mmCIF file of C-alpha atoms and ligand atoms in Angstrom:
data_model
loop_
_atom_site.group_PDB
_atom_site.id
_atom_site.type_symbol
_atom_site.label_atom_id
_atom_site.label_comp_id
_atom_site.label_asym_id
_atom_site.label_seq_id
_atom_site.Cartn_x
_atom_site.Cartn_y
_atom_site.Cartn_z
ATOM 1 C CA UNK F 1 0.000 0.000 0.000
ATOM 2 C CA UNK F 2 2.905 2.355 -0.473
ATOM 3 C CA UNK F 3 1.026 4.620 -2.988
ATOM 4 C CA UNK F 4 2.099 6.925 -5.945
ATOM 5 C CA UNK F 5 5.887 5.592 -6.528
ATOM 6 C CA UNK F 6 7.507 3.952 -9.500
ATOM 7 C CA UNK F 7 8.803 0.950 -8.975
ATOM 8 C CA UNK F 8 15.639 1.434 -13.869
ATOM 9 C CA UNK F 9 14.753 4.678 -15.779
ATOM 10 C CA UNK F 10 12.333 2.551 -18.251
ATOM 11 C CA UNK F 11 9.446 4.101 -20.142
ATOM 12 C CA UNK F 12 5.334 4.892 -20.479
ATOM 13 C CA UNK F 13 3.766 2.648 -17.788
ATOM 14 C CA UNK F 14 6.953 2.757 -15.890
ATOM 15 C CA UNK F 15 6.820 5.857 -15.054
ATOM 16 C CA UNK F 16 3.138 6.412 -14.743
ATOM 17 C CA UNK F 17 1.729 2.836 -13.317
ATOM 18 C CA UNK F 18 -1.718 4.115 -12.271
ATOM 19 C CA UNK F 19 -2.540 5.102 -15.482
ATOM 20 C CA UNK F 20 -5.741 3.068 -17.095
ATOM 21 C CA UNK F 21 -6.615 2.621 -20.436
ATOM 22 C CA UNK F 22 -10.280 2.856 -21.245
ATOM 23 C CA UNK F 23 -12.403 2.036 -24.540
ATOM 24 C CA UNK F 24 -16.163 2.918 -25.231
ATOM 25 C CA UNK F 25 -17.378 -0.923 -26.438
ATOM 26 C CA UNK F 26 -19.618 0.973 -29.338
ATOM 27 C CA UNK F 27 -18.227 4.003 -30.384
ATOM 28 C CA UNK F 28 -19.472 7.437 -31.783
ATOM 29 C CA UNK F 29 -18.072 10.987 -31.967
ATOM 30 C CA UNK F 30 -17.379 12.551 -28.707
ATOM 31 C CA UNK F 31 -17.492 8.619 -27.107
ATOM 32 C CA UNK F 32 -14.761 6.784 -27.885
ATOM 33 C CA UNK F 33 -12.051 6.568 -25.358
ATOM 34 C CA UNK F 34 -10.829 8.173 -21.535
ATOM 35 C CA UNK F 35 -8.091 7.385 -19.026
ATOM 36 C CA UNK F 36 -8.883 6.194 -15.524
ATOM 37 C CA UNK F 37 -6.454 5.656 -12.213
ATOM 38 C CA UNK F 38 -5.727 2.381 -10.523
ATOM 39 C CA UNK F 39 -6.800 3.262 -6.667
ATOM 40 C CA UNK F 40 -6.579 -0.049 -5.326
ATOM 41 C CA UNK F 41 -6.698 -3.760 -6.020
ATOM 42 C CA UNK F 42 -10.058 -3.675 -7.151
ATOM 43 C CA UNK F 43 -10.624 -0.129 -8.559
ATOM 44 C CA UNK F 44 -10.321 2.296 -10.821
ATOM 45 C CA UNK F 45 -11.309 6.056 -10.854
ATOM 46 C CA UNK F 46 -12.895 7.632 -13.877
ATOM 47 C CA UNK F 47 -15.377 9.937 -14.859
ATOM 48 C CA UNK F 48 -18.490 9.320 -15.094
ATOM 49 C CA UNK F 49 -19.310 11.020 -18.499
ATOM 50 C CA UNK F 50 -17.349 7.680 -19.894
ATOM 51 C CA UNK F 51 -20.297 5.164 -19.325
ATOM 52 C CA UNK F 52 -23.630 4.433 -20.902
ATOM 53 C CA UNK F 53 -26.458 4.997 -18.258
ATOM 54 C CA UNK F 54 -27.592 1.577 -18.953
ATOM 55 C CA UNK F 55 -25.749 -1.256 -18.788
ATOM 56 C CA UNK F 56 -22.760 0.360 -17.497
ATOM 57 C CA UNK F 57 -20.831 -2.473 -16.869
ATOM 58 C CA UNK F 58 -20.778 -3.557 -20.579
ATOM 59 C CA UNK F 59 -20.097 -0.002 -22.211
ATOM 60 C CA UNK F 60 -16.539 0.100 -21.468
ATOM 61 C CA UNK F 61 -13.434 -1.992 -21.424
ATOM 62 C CA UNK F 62 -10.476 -1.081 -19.770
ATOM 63 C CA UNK F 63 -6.848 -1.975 -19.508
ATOM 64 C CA UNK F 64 -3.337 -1.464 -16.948
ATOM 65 C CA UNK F 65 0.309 -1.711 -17.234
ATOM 66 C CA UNK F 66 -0.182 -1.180 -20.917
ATOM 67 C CA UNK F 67 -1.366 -4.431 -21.379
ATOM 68 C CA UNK F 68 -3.477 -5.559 -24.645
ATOM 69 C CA UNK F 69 -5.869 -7.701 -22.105
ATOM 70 C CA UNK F 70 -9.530 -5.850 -20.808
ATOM 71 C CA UNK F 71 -9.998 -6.524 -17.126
ATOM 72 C CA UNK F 72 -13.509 -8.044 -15.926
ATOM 73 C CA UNK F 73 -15.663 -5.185 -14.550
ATOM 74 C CA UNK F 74 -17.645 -5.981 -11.795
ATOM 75 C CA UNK F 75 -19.738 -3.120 -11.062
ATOM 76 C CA UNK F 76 -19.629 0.763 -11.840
ATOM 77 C CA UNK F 77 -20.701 3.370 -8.948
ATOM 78 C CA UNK F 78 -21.509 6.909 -10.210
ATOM 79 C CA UNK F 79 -21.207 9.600 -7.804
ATOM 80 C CA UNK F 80 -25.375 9.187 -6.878
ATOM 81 C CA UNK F 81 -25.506 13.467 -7.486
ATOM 82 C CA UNK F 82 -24.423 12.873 -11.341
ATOM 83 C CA UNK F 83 -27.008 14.150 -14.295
ATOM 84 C CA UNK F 84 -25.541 15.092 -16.970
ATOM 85 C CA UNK F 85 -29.080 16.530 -18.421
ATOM 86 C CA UNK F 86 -29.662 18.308 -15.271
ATOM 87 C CA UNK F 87 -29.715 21.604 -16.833
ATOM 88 C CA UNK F 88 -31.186 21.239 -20.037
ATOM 89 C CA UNK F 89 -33.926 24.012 -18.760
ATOM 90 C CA UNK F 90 -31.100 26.248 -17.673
ATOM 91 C CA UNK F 91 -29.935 26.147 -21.658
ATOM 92 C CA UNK F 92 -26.458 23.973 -20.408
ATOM 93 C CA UNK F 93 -27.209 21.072 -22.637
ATOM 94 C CA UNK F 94 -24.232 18.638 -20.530
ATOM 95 C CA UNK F 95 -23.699 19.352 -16.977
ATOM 96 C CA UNK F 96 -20.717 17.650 -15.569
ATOM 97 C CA UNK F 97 -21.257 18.278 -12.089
ATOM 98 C CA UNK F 98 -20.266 15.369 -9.513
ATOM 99 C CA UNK F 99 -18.967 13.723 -12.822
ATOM 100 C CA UNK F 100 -16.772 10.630 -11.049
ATOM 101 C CA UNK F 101 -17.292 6.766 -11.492
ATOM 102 C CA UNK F 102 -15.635 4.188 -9.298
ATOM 103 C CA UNK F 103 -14.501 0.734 -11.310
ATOM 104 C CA UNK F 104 -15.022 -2.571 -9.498
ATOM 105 C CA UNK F 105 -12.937 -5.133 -10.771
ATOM 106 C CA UNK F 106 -13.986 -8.464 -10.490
ATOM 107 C CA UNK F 107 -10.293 -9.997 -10.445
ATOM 108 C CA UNK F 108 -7.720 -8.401 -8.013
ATOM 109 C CA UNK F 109 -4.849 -6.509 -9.722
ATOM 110 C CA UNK F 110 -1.255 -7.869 -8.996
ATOM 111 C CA UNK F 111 0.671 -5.061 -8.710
ATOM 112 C CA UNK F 112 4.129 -4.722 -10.107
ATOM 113 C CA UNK F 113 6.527 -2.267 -12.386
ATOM 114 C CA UNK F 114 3.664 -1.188 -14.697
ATOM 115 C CA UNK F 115 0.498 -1.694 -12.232
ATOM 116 C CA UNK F 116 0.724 0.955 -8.968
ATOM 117 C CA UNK F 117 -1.665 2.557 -7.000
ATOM 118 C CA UNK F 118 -1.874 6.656 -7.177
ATOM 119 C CA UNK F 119 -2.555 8.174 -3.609
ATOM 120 C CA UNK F 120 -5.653 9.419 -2.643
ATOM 121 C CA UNK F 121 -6.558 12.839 -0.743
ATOM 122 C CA UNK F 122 -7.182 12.173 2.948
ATOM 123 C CA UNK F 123 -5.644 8.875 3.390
ATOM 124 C CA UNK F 124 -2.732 7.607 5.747
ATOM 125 C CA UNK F 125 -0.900 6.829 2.294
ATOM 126 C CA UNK F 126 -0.902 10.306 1.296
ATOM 127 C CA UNK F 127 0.229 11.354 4.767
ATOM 128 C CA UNK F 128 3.033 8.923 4.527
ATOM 129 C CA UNK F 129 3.732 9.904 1.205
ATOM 130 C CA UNK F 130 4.209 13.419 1.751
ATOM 131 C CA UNK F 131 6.170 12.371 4.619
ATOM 132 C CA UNK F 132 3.718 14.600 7.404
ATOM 133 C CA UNK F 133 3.395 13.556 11.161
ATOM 134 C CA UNK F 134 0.863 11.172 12.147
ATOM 135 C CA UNK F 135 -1.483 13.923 13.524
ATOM 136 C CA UNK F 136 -1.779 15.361 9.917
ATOM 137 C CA UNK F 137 -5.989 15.925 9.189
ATOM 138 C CA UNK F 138 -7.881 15.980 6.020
ATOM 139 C CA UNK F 139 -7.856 19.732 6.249
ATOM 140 C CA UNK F 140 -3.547 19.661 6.453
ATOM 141 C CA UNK F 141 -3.745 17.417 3.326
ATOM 142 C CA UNK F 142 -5.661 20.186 1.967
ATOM 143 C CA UNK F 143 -3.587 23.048 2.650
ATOM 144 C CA UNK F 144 -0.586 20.981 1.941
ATOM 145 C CA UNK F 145 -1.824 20.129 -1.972
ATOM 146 C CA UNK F 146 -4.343 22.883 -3.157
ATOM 147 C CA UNK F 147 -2.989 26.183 -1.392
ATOM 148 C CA UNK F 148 -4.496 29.033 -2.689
ATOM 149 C CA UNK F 149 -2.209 30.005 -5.628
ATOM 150 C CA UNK F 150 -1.320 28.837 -8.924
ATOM 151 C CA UNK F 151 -0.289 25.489 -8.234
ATOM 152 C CA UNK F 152 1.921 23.260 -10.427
ATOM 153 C CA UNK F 153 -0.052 20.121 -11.409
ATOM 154 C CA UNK F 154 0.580 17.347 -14.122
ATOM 155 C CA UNK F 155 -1.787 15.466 -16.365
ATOM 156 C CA UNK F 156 -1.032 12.091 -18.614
ATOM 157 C CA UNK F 157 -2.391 11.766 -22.704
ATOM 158 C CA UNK F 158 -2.154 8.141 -24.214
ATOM 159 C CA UNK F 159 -1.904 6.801 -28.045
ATOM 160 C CA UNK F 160 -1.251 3.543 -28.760
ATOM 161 C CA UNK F 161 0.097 2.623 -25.426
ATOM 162 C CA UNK F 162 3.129 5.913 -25.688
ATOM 163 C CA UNK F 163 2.367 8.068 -22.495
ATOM 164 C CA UNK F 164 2.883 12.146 -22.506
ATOM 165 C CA UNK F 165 2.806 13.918 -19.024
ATOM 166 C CA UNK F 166 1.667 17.476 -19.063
ATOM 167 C CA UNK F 167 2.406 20.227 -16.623
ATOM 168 C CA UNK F 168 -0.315 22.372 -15.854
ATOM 169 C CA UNK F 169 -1.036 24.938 -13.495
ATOM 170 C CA UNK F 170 -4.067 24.557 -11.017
ATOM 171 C CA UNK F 171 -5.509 28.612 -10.573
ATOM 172 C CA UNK F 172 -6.260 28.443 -6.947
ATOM 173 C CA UNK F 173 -4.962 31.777 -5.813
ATOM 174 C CA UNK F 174 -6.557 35.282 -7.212
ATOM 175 C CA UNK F 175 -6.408 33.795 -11.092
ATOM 176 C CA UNK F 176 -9.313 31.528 -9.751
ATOM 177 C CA UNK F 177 -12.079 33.933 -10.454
ATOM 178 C CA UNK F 178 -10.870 34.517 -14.047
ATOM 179 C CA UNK F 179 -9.972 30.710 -14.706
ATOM 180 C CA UNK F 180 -14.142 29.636 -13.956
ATOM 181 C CA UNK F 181 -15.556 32.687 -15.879
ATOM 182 C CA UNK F 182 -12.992 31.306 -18.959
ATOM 183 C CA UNK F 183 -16.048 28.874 -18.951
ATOM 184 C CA UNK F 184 -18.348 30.679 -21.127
ATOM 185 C CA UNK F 185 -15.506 30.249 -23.955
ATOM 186 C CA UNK F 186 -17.214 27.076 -23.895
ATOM 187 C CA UNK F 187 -19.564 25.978 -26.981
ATOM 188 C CA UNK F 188 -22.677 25.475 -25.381
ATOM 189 C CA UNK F 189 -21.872 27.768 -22.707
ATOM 190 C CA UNK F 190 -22.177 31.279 -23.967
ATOM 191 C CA UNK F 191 -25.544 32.047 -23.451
ATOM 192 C CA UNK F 192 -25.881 31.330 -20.363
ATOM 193 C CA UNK F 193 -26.481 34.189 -17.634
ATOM 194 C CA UNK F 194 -24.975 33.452 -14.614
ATOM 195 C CA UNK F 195 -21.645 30.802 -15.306
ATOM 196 C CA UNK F 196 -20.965 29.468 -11.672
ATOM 197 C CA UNK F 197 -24.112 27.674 -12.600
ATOM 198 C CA UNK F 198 -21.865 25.550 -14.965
ATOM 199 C CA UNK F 199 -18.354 26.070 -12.664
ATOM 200 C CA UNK F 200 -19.880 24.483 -9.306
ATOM 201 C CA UNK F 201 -17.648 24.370 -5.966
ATOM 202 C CA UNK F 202 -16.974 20.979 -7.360
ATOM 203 C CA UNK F 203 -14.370 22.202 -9.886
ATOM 204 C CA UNK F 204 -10.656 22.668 -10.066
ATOM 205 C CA UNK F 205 -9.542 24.605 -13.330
ATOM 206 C CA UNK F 206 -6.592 24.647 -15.494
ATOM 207 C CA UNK F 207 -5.601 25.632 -18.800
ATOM 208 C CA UNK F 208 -4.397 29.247 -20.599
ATOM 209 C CA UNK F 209 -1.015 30.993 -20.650
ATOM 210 C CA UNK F 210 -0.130 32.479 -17.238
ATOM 211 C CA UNK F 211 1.429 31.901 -15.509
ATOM 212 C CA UNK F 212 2.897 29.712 -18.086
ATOM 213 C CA UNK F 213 1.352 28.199 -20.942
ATOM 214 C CA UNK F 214 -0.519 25.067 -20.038
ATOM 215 C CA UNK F 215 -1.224 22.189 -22.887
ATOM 216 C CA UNK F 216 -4.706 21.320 -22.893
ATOM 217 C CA UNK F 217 -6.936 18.441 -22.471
ATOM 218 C CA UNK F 218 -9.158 16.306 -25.110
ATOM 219 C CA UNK F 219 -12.203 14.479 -24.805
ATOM 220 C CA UNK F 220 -9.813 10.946 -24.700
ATOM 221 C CA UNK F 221 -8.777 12.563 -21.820
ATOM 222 C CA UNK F 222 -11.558 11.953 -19.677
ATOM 223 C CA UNK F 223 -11.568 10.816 -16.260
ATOM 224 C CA UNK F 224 -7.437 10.594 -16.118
ATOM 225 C CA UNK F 225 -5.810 11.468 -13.039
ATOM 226 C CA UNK F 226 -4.729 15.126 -12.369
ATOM 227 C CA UNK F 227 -1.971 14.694 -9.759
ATOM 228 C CA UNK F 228 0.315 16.674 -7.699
ATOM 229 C CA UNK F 229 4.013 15.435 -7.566
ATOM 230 C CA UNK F 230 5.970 16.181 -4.574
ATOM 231 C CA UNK F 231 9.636 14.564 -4.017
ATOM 232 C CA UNK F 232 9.019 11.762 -5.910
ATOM 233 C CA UNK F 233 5.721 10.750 -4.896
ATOM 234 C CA UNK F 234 2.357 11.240 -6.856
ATOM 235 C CA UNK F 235 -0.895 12.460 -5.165
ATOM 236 C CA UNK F 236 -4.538 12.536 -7.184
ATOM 237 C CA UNK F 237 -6.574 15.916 -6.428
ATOM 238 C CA UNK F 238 -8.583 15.677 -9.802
ATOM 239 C CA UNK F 239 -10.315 13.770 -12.133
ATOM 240 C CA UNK F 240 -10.617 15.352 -15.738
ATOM 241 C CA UNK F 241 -14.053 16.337 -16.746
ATOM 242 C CA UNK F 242 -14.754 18.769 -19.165
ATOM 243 C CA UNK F 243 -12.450 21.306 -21.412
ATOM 244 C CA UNK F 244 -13.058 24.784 -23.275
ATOM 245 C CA UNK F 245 -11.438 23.692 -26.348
ATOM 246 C CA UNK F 246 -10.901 20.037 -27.818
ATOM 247 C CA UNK F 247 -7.196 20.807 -28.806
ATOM 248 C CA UNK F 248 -7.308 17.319 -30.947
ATOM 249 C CA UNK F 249 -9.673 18.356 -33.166
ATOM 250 C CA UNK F 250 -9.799 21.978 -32.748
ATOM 251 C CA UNK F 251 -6.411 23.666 -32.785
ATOM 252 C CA UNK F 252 -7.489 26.656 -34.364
ATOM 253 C CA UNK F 253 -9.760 27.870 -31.674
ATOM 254 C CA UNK F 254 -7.212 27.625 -28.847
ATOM 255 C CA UNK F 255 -4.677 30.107 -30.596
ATOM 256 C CA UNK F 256 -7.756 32.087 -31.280
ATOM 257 C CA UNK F 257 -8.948 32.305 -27.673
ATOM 258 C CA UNK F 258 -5.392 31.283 -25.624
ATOM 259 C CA UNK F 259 -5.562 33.217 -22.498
ATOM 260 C CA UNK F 260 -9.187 31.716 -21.973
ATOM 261 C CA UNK F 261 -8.897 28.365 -23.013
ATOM 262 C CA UNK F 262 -9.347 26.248 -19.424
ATOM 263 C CA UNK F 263 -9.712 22.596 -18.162
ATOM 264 C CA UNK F 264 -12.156 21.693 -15.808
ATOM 265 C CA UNK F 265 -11.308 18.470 -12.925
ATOM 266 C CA UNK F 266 -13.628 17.047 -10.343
ATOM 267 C CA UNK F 267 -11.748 18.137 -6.852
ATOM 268 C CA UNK F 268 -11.458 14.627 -5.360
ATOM 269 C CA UNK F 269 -11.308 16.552 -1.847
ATOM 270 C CA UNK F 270 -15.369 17.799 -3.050
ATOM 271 C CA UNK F 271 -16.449 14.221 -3.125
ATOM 272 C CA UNK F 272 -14.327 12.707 -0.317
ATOM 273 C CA UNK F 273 -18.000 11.673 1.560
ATOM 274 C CA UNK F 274 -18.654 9.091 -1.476
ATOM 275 C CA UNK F 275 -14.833 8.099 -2.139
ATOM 276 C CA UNK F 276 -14.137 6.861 1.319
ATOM 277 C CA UNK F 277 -17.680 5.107 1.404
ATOM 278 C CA UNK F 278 -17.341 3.197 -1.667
ATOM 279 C CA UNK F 279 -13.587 2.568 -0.839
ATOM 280 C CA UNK F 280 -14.472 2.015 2.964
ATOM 281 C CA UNK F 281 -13.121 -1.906 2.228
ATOM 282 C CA UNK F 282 -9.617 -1.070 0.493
ATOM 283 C CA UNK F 283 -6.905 -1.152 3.277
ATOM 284 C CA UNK F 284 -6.335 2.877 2.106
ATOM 285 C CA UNK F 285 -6.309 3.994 5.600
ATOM 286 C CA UNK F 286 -8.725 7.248 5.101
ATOM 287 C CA UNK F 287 -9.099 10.656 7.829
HETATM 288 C C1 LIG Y 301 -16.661 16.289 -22.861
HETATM 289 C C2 LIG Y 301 -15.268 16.937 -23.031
HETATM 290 C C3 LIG Y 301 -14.286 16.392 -22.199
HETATM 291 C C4 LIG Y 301 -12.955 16.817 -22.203
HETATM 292 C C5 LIG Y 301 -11.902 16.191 -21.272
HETATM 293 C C6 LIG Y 301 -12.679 17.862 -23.089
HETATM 294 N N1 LIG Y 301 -11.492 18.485 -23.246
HETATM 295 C C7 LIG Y 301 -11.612 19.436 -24.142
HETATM 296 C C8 LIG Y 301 -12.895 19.522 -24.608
HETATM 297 C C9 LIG Y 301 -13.669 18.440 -23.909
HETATM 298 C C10 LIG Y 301 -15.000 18.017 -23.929
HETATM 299 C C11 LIG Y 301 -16.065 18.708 -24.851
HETATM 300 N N2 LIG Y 301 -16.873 19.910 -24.323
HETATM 301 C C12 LIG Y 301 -17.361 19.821 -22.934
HETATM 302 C C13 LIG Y 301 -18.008 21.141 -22.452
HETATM 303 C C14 LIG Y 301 -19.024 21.709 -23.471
HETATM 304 C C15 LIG Y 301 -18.179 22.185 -24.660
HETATM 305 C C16 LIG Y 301 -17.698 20.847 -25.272
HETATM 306 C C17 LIG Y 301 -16.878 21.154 -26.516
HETATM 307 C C18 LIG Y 301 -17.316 20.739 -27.796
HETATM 308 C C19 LIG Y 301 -16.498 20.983 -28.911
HETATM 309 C C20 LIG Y 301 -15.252 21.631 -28.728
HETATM 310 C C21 LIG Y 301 -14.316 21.883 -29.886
HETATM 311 O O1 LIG Y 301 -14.683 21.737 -31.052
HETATM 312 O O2 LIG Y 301 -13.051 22.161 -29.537
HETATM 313 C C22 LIG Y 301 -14.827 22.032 -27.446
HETATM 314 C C23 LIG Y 301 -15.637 21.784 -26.332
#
C-alpha cells in the first residue's frame, strides 16, 4: 500500500503505473475513449461522463500496465448526485457536475513495475507519502496540496500505449475567479447568464497561458488522473471532466482564444464523503 511511486529509468507505464486505459465498447463521436487511475486492487477512478447509463458495466473496457488484455468489470458506482441533463432548462445542454465513477474489478490486480496505485486525498498513504506527522488531518492534506495560488499540477495523454505527461497549473490563488468565468468560452456555454451555474464548488480549473502556458486536455482525456508530484511521490486531487477547447480536433480555436482556453477536474477533496464510502473496504487507511 505504499502509494504513488515507481517501482531502472524505463518508459510509459513505468513511469506512470496508475494510469488506465479505457475504450467505449460501441463508439461514436465525442465517445470513444478516456483514461482512468488504478486506486486499489479492485478499482479504478474515472469519470463518469465515460459510461452508458444503462448497462454500465458492458459499455466500457479497460486496460493497466499497458497491457493488450480488458480486465472483468464488476460493477460501476456513479457519484449518486451525477445528471448530466440536469440543466437542459437552464440552456447547459451537458452538466458535468459530480462527474466521477468508481470501477469494481472483479479480479484483483497484482501489482508490479507497470500496475501501482496513485494516492488518494485524505488517506494515511498520502500522509506517509508526503512524509507529514501522524497527527496530519484531512484539512492539512488540503492546505498541503491545493494552497491558494497557482499550483503546479501534471496530467497524462495516451496513443497507442506511448504516455505524454503534461504540466499544468491549477488557478487556486486570485487567477481563480478569471480561470471559472474562462467557462463561457465554452460551446454550449455562452448564453448562459450566470456561469458558476456551470463552474460548481466541485471544480478545479486549469488551462491558458499564465502563468505559463498550459497544454490542454481532449475528450480521450476523460476521467485521467490530475496529480500533484511532490519529491518523488504522486498524489490525485482531480479527475478530468470537461475542457473549453478540444485541442485534438480543434487547434485553431485555442490560438484564437489562448488566455481563456481552461480545463475543468472534479476536486477529489469535493467528493471525499462518497470516495471513502465506496472505498471504505480497500486497506487505504482514510481521515
Ligand atoms: C466532454 C469533453 C471532455 C474533455 C476532457 C474535453 N477536453 C476538451 C474539450 C472536452 C470536452 C467537450 N466539451 C465539454 C463542455 C461543453 C463544450 C464541449 C466542446 C465541444 C467541442 C469543442 C471543440 O470543437 O473544440 C470544445 C468543447
Amino acid at each position: 500500500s505504499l502509494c504513488g511511486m515507481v517501482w531502472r529509468k524505463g518508459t510509459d507505464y513505468h513511469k506512470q503505473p496508475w494510469q488506465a486505459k479505457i475504450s467505449v465498447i460501441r463508439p461514436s463521436k465525442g465517445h470513444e475513449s478516456c483514461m482512468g487511475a488504478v486506486v486499489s486492487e479492485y478499482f479504478v477512478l474515472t469519470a463518469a461522463h465515460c459510461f452508458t447509463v444503462d448497462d454500465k458495466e458492458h459499455s466500457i473496457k479497460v486496460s493497466v500496465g499497458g497491457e493488450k488484455r480488458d480486465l472483468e468489470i464488476e460493477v460501476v458506482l456513479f457519484h449518486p448526485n451525477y445528471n448530466i441533463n440536469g440543466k437542459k432548462e437552464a440552456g447547459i445542454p451537458e452538466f458535468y457536475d459530480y462527474d466521477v465513477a468508481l470501477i469494481k474489478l472483479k479480479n484483483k490486480l497484482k501489482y508490479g513495475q507497470t500496475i501501482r496505485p496513485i494516492c488518494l486525498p485524505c488517506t494515511e498513504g498520502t500522509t506517509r507519502a508526503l512524509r507529514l506527522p501522524p497527527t496530519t488531518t484531512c484539512q492539512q492534506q488540503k492546505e498541503e496540496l491545493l494552497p491558494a495560488q497557482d499550483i503546479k499540477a501534471l496530467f497524462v495523454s495516451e496513443e497507442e500505449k506511448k504516455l505524454t505527461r503534461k504540466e499544468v497549473y491549477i488557478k487556486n490563488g486570485d487567477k481563480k475567479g478569471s480561470c471559472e468565468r474562462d467557462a463561457q468560452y465554452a460551446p454550449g456555454y455562452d448564453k448562459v447568464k450566470d456561469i458558476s451555474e456551470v463552474v460548481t464548488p466541485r471544480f478545479l480549473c486549469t488551462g491558458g497561458v499564465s502563468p505559463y502556458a498550459d497544454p490542454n486536455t481532449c475528450r480521450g482525456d476523460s476521467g485521467g488522473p490530475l496529480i500533484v508530484h511532490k519529491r518523488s511521490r504522486f498524489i490525485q486531487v482531480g479527475v478530468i471532466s470537461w475542457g473549453v477547447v478540444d485541442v485534438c480536433k480543434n487547434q485553431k480555436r485555442q490560438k484564437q482564444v489562448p488566455a481563456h482556453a481552461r480545463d475543468f477536474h472534479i476536486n477529489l477533496f469535493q467528493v471525499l464523503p462518497w470516495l471513502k464510502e465506496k472505498l471504505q473496504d480497500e486497506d487505504l487507511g482514510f481521515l
